[PDB]
């Protein structure tokens, strides 16, 4: 038996830890990702891999919704995309969003 709701994040990345000796969380594999993709469930996969494993507004506002009793998410965009985008921008690469 083991579970976790809100513990510590890993140093290298803001993801839940694993195992029992340290209070981690269950590991979501990529085949589980494919299965989620197999179902039409879209929001579930996004939030699971994003807020249940990051965005400051997403997790804070989720705390506000849940404590308020609301069950709803502003998906927004998880800043890691911005990290990659500006890393590429540092390189001589004109990569950008579009309309």
């Amino acid at each position: 038996m083991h579970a976790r709701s809100t513990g510590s994040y890993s140093l290298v990345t803001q993801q839940p830890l694993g195992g029992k000796a340290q209070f981690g969380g269950q590991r979501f594999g990529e085949m589980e990702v494919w299965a989620l993709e197999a179902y039409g469930a879209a929001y579930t996969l996004q939030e699971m891999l994003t807020v249940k494993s990051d965005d400051v507004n997403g997790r804070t506002k989720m705390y506000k919704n849940i404590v308020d009793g609301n069950h709803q998410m502003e998906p927004g965009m998880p800043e890691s995309f911005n990290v990659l985008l500006k890393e590429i921008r540092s390189l001589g690469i004109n990569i950008e969003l579009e309309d």
Binding site: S5, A38, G40, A42, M77, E87, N94
Partner: protein, 1332 residues
């Protein structure tokens, strides 16, 4: 929210637009106080305030002053998030080369200027030169120079001529090159030049140049002039626990700033040419190491001697951000434990230990708590819940009132391995899981530890309750069978229900209904089962969706009548009036869903579970030693087998037979004895119950527990019960050869040391094979998913008239898969034409579900043209009508729902379950033949003069129920268009030796037969009548080599006999090593001989890879009269001359093969030449798309059917369509794409479609059958490729292409973290698409 990401090349104007300052000084932090430095790596005005709304000078900490900058420090008072976002720049005095294009290999720059890489490398690092605007000089424009010949150029051409060195020279070159003239001259060269290497380099150059012209980029942008710099936060300066500051990117930027500042200072001081040369070289190397350290030669070092980290490192490798944080992660609000049953639960609902509920929903409970105001502050609420106070459980029940959750298993093979359920609070420490769904999870209760997740947003709750809900998941995706079939125990109870004992209590009376039947059963006044007439009522829906209630007496068993109550109204009674095997109950569920929809099925299954468990408990179904019976004949049979094997061994000792033959006969007789034992024990088992009938005696089906178990299909099979009672057959050895001595003993008796030892060899081999198969299946499944990640349904109907043809399948025996199964749920492409001809049996573009399929079946429809995904004309997707039904759902497939992933996953799931003469016609019918070319032999029988002939037995109705491949010259007692009795031997032949049967009759003259040089006279020692023997090429002299052995038939006059249909004589040439039997002066009859011519899972994986076989079965490229060519130039040459087309095509063959076709045969293309393994690509390029697809589906279906698992063909259809997405152009036509250019099919398809929509013509193409892995590599989704084993080449190609990457694709949306454009998000995205 938005659409396709756009990539392109950075530009100095773009750079300064993004940047908002220059870091003109290399400082980072004061390191005396903690404030930063002005215009350092950490700067305030350039980037922003470190703290939240606080000027560095501190003039404005107030939110009222938000946005307005100070003046003491010039710092815009704003959140420090701006520091995370604001880029910067560095102005470079000298142009800097972008290392990525320098060593992309193919280097973009080296081949864009058409220059070797070593020379341009030498020029860049300031040890050479390059001519710029050479003009009227002795120096080519592209020429490079060094110091001595630079001085020579200065001497001879110190005038106007200019030659530069370094990145500045390269930038000048890139500015001084023309695009349209280059395209023109290169196109002319491609048109005229005929050197394949030249053609290759030119097509690459032209594709790059025309793409860059299509791009808005400019070539100098490949040369860096202003260097963007990261925002400081993304290059943090972490102070360790002490007076030390450990990111290397800060060091790299400091070094670059120092080098650039020193270069500026030297230029101001005007240092000599060599010093500025060296400074520029060092700056170039610093920039290179900053971008890519180690891409160049010996890299710079970090701490002691270990390499530091660069931007490529940040992006590349496992630690690279794609592979670092876009992969299987860990998840909060997640749990795991071993699982149990709790059968009293319902499939719409699941168990969950109370403690897990407590910890999982802490924020939820806090929200409800502060709503109730039990403890306002969150810390107090945390204290209350961890104390586990009284009121908290009410809150837990409230939140769990409606809040489904996800249950999951580790080896998530197929998608039911994740599933939504409603928790119920259960004490203890284990998760109660519904029984039946475990079978979908294939998760025994050995101790499997399943995990649990919780959705957060109401939309996710909607998805789970609506999509991942067991109610919404009852049928398999692989095919329509209910995945909720009961497995092993409850099936025993139900089998116990619908089985009769001839005489017991409650035998021989009558009842008015099932209710009193249960009453009498529970009373113990009657037996659980006995033949009894009882009135029952059924409610039939034959009317237009209207119930009709009828009633009548039916003979039945008491348990059967008791079961009748649980049936819903719609179903009839005959369905329950059988023994109710696992297959029988499976089709019971199938009927229930197909007639009554979903909710009645759910309720029916729940009650089936409950009642069957209860009555299995009532059963007392046990097992004991006595319950297994060993027939006494086992002793006698074994004695006979021992005597026989001793006799055969003695015969071998007598020398009559060989050791191999001795062993073969021994194993044969042992197997026969084992079969006798199996029959004896099965007879002893099945009908052992022999008892009074209420009279004297009767024998009925046996009530021994083991036969009830086996026949019920609860577990096991005939083989295992055979092992239990009788001998466990013959075991093989580790080498795999079957062992001569079988396992004489049986499990019920003791097993000797040796038999157990050999059985252990076998079992351990099986176990290791299972482990290896598990690993290989996992890897192959990974491949299948990643190749097919992209495909998604995007359109309803392609409006195409074209589809595949579907028919039943007969290998040469029983039909193995009927038409009903293959055609179900699929939209017809062409209407069905019954043989009431001029009958449109069904419309042309309608779905075919079970009622329509049964209509077709009773109509005896044999071949049906149906829509297929491969024939879909959907641009960048698939049409729904092309796909048909979405199995696991009733309605046709819905828009947007992707299918590639589920298809791959379904086909891969059984990867664990896989494994690592003459004919007697049975049926009665008329005779039909295909590929028919026959003749009546001398004896009057029909022999076939066509190798590819096949016999069909047209049944009485008219359909081909039987099909068998007829070899050449077979013996037929009958002919085509005739009647054959069932069980009459007409199909017979001699498989050995290749006949030389003659088309015509006449004298057989020695036309071109030289004796002693070409042929040899070999005398037979048995009879005396010898036969001329033709030698092979090598054995004879070369003089006789060209001298062909030819047999030309002539009439009585000696003139050539003209074969009907042509004028050529009946010349019958012979190959080498041919025994010419007949001699001169003999007339022959027609069809008369002249001479005596002497897999598992890896197989499926290779078929996906489409790997060429060891010896392919060569086919005819082009139709026409065949003919022989040059001889023994390594291979023999054949040429096909079309009667009107163009002959010159020649094909080499290793003539050691047993060839098929004769020299003077006219054939159609795609005709077998050598026989053996058949490649797919030849089939594609000769037969077409349909032929190869049909072969692949047939083979893979055969494999999976052999292993006993059924998968709908559509999954293979889609994987094949993806596998062939690429193609090669045949002619450019009016299009600009080059002749040999390889392009993805959809691109050229839309291109030539629009071009032909105008007055212009389209283009010619040829689809290419690319291996699955190669196809995965060849994908326009570079973001996928970027996360696929490399970044350098991928991003270079993307930038030079500047490809607007479509959100189309699946992993990419996950990688960037945006929503899937497949399910709900698709619809949402369409709104975004509607917005833009």
């Amino acid at each position: 929210e938005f659409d396709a990401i756009k990539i392109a090349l950075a530009s100095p104007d773009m750079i300064r637009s993004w940047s908002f300052g220059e870091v003109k000084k290399p400082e980072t932090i004061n390191y005396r106080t903690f404030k930063p430095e002005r215009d350092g790596l950490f700067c305030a005005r350039i980037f922003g305030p470190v703290k939240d709304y606080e000027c560095l000078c501190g003039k404005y900490k107030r939110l009222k002053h938000r946005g307005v900058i100070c003046e003491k420090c010039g710092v815009e008072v704003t959140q420090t998030k701006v520091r995370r976002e604001r880029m910067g720049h560095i102005e470079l005095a000298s142009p800097t080369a972008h290392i990525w294009f320098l060593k992309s290999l193919p280097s973009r720059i080296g081949l864009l200027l058409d220059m070797p890489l070593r020379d341009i490398e030498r020029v860049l690092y300031f040890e050479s030169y390059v001519v710029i605007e050479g003009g009227m000089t002795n120096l080519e424009r592209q020429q490079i120079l060094t110091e001595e010949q630079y001085l020579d150029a200065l001497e001879e051409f110190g005038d106007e001529f200019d030659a530069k060195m370094g990145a500045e020279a390269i930038q000048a070159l890139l500015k001084s090159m023309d695009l349209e003239q280059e395209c023109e001259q290169l196109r002319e060269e491609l048109n005229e030049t005929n050197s394949e290497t030249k053609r290759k380099k030119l097509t690459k150059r032209i594709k790059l140049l025309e793409a860059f012209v299509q791009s808005g980029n400019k070539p100098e942008w490949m040369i860096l002039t202003v260097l963007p710099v990261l925002p400081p936060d993304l290059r943090p300066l972490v102070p360790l626990d002490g007076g030390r500051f450990a990111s290397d990117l800060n060091d790299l930027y400091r070094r670059v700033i120092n080098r650039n500042n020193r270069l500026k200072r030297l230029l101001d001081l005007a240092a000599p040419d060599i010093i500025v040369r060296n400074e520029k070289r060092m700056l170039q190397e610093a920039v290179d190491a900053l971008l890519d350290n180690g891409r160049r030669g010996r890299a710079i070092t970090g701490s002691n001697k270990r390499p530091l980290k660069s931007l490529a490192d940040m992006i590349k490798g496992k630690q690279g951000r794609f592979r670092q944080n876009l992969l299987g992660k860990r998840v909060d609000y997640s749990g795991r434990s071993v699982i149990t049953v709790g059968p009293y639960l319902r499939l719409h609902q699941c168990g969950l230990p109370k403690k897990m509920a407590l910890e999982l929903f802490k924020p939820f409970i806090y929200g409800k708590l502060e709503l109730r105001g039990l403890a306002t502050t969150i810390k107090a609420a945390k204290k209350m819940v961890e104390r586990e106070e009284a009121v908290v459980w009410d809150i837990l029940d409230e939140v769990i009132r409606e809040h489904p959750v996800l249950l999951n298993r580790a080896p998530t093979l197929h998608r039911l391995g994740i599933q939504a359920f409603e928790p119920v609070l259960i004490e203890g420490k284990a998760i109660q899981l519904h029984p039946l769904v475990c079978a979908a999870y294939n998760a025994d209760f050995d101790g499997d530890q399943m995990a649990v997740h919780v959705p957060l947003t109401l939309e996710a709750q909607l998805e789970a309750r609506a999509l991942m809900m067991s109610t919404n998941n009852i049928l398999s995706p692989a095919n329509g069978e209910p995945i909720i079939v009961p497995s092993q125990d409850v099936v025993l109870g139900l089998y116990y229900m619908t089985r009769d004992c001839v005489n017991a209590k409650g035998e021989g009376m009558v009842l008015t209904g099932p209710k009193e039947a249960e009453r009498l059963y529970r009373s113990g006044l009657a037996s659980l089962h006995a033949r009894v007439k009882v009135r029952i009522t059924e409610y039939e829906k034959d009317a237009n969706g209207e119930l009709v209630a009828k009633t009548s007496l039916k003979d039945t068993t008491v348990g059967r009548a008791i079961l009748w109550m649980i049936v819903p109204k719609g179903l009839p009674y005959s369905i329950v009036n059988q023994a109710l095997g696992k297959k029988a109950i499976s089709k019971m569920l199938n009927t229930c869903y197909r007639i009554l929809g979903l909710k009645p099925t759910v309720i029916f299954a729940d009650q089936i579970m409950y009642t069957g468990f209860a009555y299995a408990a009532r059963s007392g179904a046990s097992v004991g030693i006595d319950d297994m019976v060993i027939p006494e004949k086992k002793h006698e049979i074994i004695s006979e087998a021992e005597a026989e094997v001793a006799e055969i061994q003695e015969q071998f000792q007598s020398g009559l037979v060989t050791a191999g033959e001795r062993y073969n006969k021994v194993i044969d007789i042992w197997a026969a004895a084992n079969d006798r034992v199996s029959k004896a024990m099965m007879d002893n088992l099945q009908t052992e119950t022999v008892i009074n009938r209420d009279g004297q005696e009767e024998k009925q089906v046996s009530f021994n527990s083991i036969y009830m178990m086996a026949d019920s299909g609860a577990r096991g099979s005939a083989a295992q019960i055979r092992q239990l009672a009788g001998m466990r057959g013959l075991m093989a050895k580790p080498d795999g050869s079957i062992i001569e001595t079988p396992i004489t003993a049986n499990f019920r008796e003791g097993l000797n040391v040796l038999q157990y030892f050999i059985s252990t060899h076998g079992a351990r081999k099986g176990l290791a094979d299972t482990a290896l198969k598990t690993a290989n299946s996992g890897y192959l499944t990974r491949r299948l998913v990643d190749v097919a990640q992209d495909l998604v349904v995007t359109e309803d109907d392609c409006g195409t008239h074209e589809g595949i043809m579907m028919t039943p399948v007969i290998e040469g025996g029983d039909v193995k898969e009927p038409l009903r199964d293959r055609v179900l749920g699929r939209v017809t492409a062409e209407d069905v034409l019954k043989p009431g001809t001029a009958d449109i049996l069904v419309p042309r573009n309608t779905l075919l579900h079970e009622q329509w399929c049964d209509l077709l079946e009773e109509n005896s429809v044999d071949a049906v043209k149906v829509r297929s995904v491969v024939s879909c004309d959907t641009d960048f997707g698939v049409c729904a009508h092309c796909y048909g039904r979405d199995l696991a759902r009733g309605h046709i497939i819905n828009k947007g729902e992707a299918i590639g992933v589920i298809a791959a996953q379904s086909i891969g799931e059984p990867g664990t379950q896989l494994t690592m003469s003459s004919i007697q016609v049975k049926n009665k019918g008329s005779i039909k033949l295909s590929n028919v070319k026959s003749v009546v032999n001398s004896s009057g029988k029909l022999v076939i003069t066509s190798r590819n002939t096949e016999l069909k037995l047209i049944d009485e109705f008219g359909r081909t129920k039987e099909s068998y491949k007829v070899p050449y010259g077979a013996v037929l007692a009958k002919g085509d268009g005739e009647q054959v009795a069932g069980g009459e031997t007409v199909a017979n032949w001699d498989p050995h030796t290749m006949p030389v049967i003659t088309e015509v009759s006449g004298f057989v003259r020695f036309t071109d037969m030289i004796d002693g040089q070409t042929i040899t006279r070999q005398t037979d020692e048995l009879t005396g009548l010898s036969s001329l023997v033709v030698l092979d090429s090598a054995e004879r002299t070369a003089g006789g080599k060209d001298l062909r052995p030819a047999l030309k038939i002539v009439d009585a006059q000696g003139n050539d006999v003209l074969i009907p249909g042509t004028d050529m004589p009946a010349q019958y040439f012979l190959p080498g090593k041919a025994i010419v039997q007949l001699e001169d002066g003999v007339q022959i009859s027609s069809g008369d001989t002249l001479a005596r011519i002497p897999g598992g899972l890896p197989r499926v994986a290779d078929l996906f890879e489409a790997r060429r076989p060891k010896e392919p079965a060569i086919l005819a490229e082009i139709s026409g009269i065949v003919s022989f060519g040059k001889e023994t130039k390594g291979k023999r040459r054949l040429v096909i001359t079309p009667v009107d087309g163009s002959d010159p095509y020649e094909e080499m063959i290793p003539k050691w093969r047993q060839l098929n076709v004769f020299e003077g045969e006219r054939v159609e293309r795609g005709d077998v030449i050598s026989d053996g393994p058949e490649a797919p690509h030849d089939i594609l390029r000769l037969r077409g798309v349909h032929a190869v697809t049909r072969y692949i589906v047939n083979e893979v279906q055969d494999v999976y059917r052999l292993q006993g698992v059924k998968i709908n063909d559509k999954h293979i259809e889609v994987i094949v369509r993806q596998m062939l997405r690429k193609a090669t152009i045949v002619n450019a036509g009016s299009s600009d794409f080059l002749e040999g250019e390889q392009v993805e099919y959809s691109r050229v398809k839309i291109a030539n479609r629009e071009l032909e929509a105008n007055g212009k013509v389209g283009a010619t193409y040829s689809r290419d059958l690319l291996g699955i892995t190669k196809a995965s590599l060849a994908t326009e989704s570079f973001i996928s490729a970027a996360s696929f084993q490399e970044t350098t080449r991928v991003l270079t190609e993307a930038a030079v292409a500047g490809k607007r990457d479509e959100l189309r694709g699946l992993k990419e949306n996950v990688i960037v973290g945006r929503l899937i454009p497949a399910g709900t998000g698709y619809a949402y995205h369409q709104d975004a698409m509607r917005r833009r």
